[PDB]
Structure formats: C-alpha cells, structure tokens
Symmetry: C2
C-alpha cells in the first residue's frame, strides 16, 4: 500500500499466524483458516517485486565512537520478503548510528539518528541456534532494524549501551 | 494496493473473528490483541488515497440481467466502508451500477471479460449470509454483493458464469 510499514505489519502477522498459533489448541475451522491465510501471505510477497526492479564520512574518521563492532543487520520490512542478513560494521558516533561494509570503508551504506528509537532483545527473529544474539532498533516513522550479534553477551552490551544513550540524555 | 487491502481484510477477519473465543494460551491471547490494535492503526496510512461514456440506466442496450444489490469493494471493506444499495445491470459484457433504476448516469462500471465469480457465504455475520457473491478482476479488485435471497445470488452467479464462459 505505503510500503515499509505495511511490510512491518505483515511480518508480525506472519509470525503470529504461522508461529504463535502453532501448537495452539484450535477448532478445525480455525486450523483450516490458518493454513489458508499462510498461503495467501506467501503469495502476496510477489507483489512488492516492482519495487525492487547526513554527509558521507569514512569509517575511521567517525568522531566520538561510543561503540563499534560487526553485527548482522536486516530491516524488518526486508525480512518479510526473505532477504538475507548482511554483515555490517556498525558504529555509534555520538547519537548517530552508522553502518558500513567493513571498518575500512570510506563511506557508509546508511545511518540513522537514534533519538526517539526504542531498542530490545528479541529472541524470535531467527529460527537457528544464534537466536539469543538478537535485538532490534525501532524508528518512530515505523522503520525497524534487526541485528544478530556475535554472542548473547555482545547483544546485551549493544542493547545496554543503546538504552543508556536513549534515555539517559533525555 | 487493493491486493494488499484484500489480504489485510482476510487477516483482520481471522485474527479478530475466527480466533474469537478459541482456546488460546496467554501469549497467544496477548499477541492477538496486540495485532488487532496494529491492524486498526495501519488503516490511517491509506487516508491520503481518499483526500465508458455516461449512459442512463434506461438507455442501456442488451440488458441480460438487472436488479437491486448491495455492493461493496473488498479493499474498501477493510477500511470500513460499508455496503450500499445499487441498481446493477449487465449490459452485454459490462457490469454497470447506479444509485437507482431511474438515474441518468452510472456511479461506475467494469467490463467482466476475464473476471471470475463465486458464491461466498463467509462475508456477512447476518441472516443475509447465504446470499452473497463476488466478482474478481484480473488486477485483483474484488466486488462483493449481497442479493435479496439465496436464490437471487445463485442466479446472478449462474448468469455471470454463463457469460464469462460461453461466449469464449
């Protein structure tokens, strides 16, 4: 419709209907309907095909780098469409979160100011053994960034550092 | 655009009605409720979207079938737009709808070539539920109708199915 936010919704819808309701004790009518909705959810993904058809600054020149490190990164609204996680060097430079191809790049792939964002651990973003490594950074404009960190601790440290900056600076 | 609101309509119906009073765990309930509020919330994003010669009902040539029906578009039903009384007329392969049998000009119309049609007794919580059907366009737009009795619905379907097939 007006896309990111809608794909954010449908991603939550799919998590719900496909996983949350799995194991639940449902009527026969509700089971049959759940299977339906999953198929419809699947098919609608093709619709967003046609869609896919702050100054630059080097990694090593970022000032006041409060935290930096390699993370896997993925936007929520890409996730719904099945896009792979991307290895990124992430840096929190002052109040602005930056992401690059590696720590030696001369220019960022993207960045965003964290004012107003929320952050949390979220163990449901992945099905494998790395799921304990995951957190998300929620935009106000409904944009959501998902990460996998290199260990459960690595993630917690990111969420703490980011949570500190988000709320102890009012 | 339509195709997405059509999915979201089925979504909202499942989560809010199908799942009502089902034997759900605490987390399933909570998440259900939380999704309901999320589905209502998105509706505001399609607000911006709302911000064939004319012919009179009576000059229409080759009226195969015609009648009062309640019409709604599925993608509109998601946003809350309800059923409206329409005089509907199939003029050859073109489906016309007017506010009354006497109007000077159609509210709209669509040619049905390549459309599908089906009975669908899941669209009303009513004593009118066994008398609805839909016409589905290739672009994924879906026109839902309620007829004045179950027989009347089946008659429109039979009649539509007939044209949509053996004309060829």
């Amino acid at each position: 419709g007006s896309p990111e936010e809608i794909r954010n919704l449908l991603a939550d819808v799919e998590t719900f209907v496909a996983d949350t309701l799995k194991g639940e004790n449902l009527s026969k009518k509700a089971k049959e309907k759940r299977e339906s909705l999953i198929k419809k959810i699947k098919d609608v993904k093709s619709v967003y095909l046609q869609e896919f058809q702050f100054p630059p600054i080097a990694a090593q020149d970022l000032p006041f780098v409060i935290k930096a490190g390699y993370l896997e990164k993925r936007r929520k609204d890409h996730s719904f469409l099945g896009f792979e996680w991307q290895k990124r060097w992430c840096a929190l430079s002052k109040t602005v979160f930056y992401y690059y191809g590696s720590d030696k790049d001369k220019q960022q792939k993207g960045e965003f100011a964290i004012d107003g964002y929320d952050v949390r651990m979220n163990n449901t973003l992945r099905k494998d053994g790395k799921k304990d490594c995951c957190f998300e950074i929620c935009a106000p404009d409904k944009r959501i960034y998902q990460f996998t960190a290199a260990s459960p601790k690595d993630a917690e440290e990111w969420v703490q550092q980011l949570k500190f900056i988000l709320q102890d600076l009012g």
